[PDB]
């Protein structure tokens, strides 16, 4: 599967060695949208980057 989104106008896929996907943003740093990538596990988030992890069609 792949992630059909990463930013407000971006999209990308992944290999078979990853697991899900997550759009990494900032906490009120810029605005909300920033970037995204693949993932292997999704525990919790942090107070520095918005780790929006998901395994839906927009990720896994």
Curated annotation (Swiss-Prot):
CC per GO annotation: extracellular region; membrane; other organism cell membrane
Cellular location(s): Secreted; Target cell membrane
Main location: secreted
Any GO BP annotation: killing of cells of another organism
Disulfide links within the chain: 3-21, 14-38, 42-53, 54-59
Tissue: Expressed by the venom gland.
Keyword Membrane: yes
GO terms, molecular function: protein kinase inhibitor activity; toxin activity
Keywords of the record: Cardiotoxin, Cytolysis, Disulfide bond, Hemolysis, Membrane, Protein kinase inhibitor, Secreted, Signal, Target cell membrane, Target membrane, Toxin
Family that this chain belongs to: Belongs to the three-finger toxin family. Short-chain subfamily. Type IA cytotoxin sub-subfamily.
Subunit structure, as described in the record: Monomer in solution; Homodimer and oligomer in the presence of negatively charged lipids forming a pore with a size ranging between 20 and 30 Angstroms.
Function: Basic protein that bind to cell membrane and depolarizes cardiomyocytes. This cytotoxin also shows lytic activities, but 2-fold more important than that of CTX-A2. It binds to the integrin alpha-V/beta-3 with a moderate affinity. Inhibits protein kinase C. It may interact with sulfatides in the cell membrane, which induces pore formation and cell internalization and is responsible for cytotoxicity in cardiomyocytes. It may also target the mitochondrial membrane and induces mitochondrial swelling and fragmentation.
Protein name, UniProt field: Cytotoxin 4
């Amino acid at each position: 599967r792949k992630c059909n989104k990463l930013v407000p106008l971006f999209y990308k896929t992944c290999p078979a060695g990853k697991n899900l996907c997550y759009k990494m943003f900032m906490v009120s740093n810029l605005t909300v949208p920033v970037k995204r990538g693949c993932i292997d596990v999704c525990p919790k988030n942090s107070a520095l980057v918005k780790y929006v992890c998901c395994n839906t069609d927009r990720c896994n």
